[PDB]
Amino acid sequence: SMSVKKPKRDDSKDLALCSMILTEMETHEDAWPFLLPVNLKLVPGYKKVIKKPMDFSTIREKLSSGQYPNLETFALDVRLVFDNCETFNEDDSDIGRAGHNMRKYFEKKWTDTFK
């Protein structure tokens, strides 16, 4: 509350560490369904069903241009990529399995880097 603060967590390396994690996600072999925006002209149903499209390139541009106010808003967009994937793809498909694998990979890096 006013004039009463928890001790200050050092957040000065967060930008660089989020960038490193994003690089590791970009370079994973199962990243291919997530590197670019889904083409809304060529994939029937996507536009209407997926209210907030997200992909790694869009995350990378937001990161580089100071559009993440903190590391939680960054984690929300990453998770949004996998949540969208689960909404549109069967678990037993290549893309469905890719999503589950990438989410697991992300969550471990996140915990090891920050928790």
Curated annotation (Swiss-Prot):
Expressed at varying levels in several tissues, whereas a smaller transcript was expressed specifically in testis. It comes from the Eukaryota. It is found in: Nucleus. Residues 9-113 form the Bromo domain. Belongs to the WAL family. Component of the BRF-1 ISWI chromatin remodeling complex, at least composed of SMARCA1 and BAZ2B, which regulates the spacing of histone octamers on the DNA template to facilitate access to DNA. Within the BRF-1 ISWI chromatin remodeling complex interacts with SMARCA1; the interaction is direct. Component of the BRF-5 ISWI chromatin remodeling complex, at least composed of SMARCA5/SNF2H and BAZ2B, which regulates the spacing of histone octamers on the DNA template to facilitate access to DNA. Regulatory subunit of the ATP-dependent BRF-1 and BRF-5 ISWI chromatin remodeling complexes, which form ordered nucleosome arrays on chromatin and facilitate access to DNA during DNA-templated processes such as DNA replication, transcription, and repair. Both complexes regulate the spacing of nucleosomes along the chromatin and have the ability to slide mononucleosomes to the center of a DNA template. The BRF-1 ISWI chromatin remodeling complex has a lower ATP hydrolysis rate than the BRF-5 ISWI chromatin remodeling complex. This is Bromodomain adjacent to zinc finger domain protein 2B. The chain holds residues 2054 to 2166 of 2168 of the full protein.
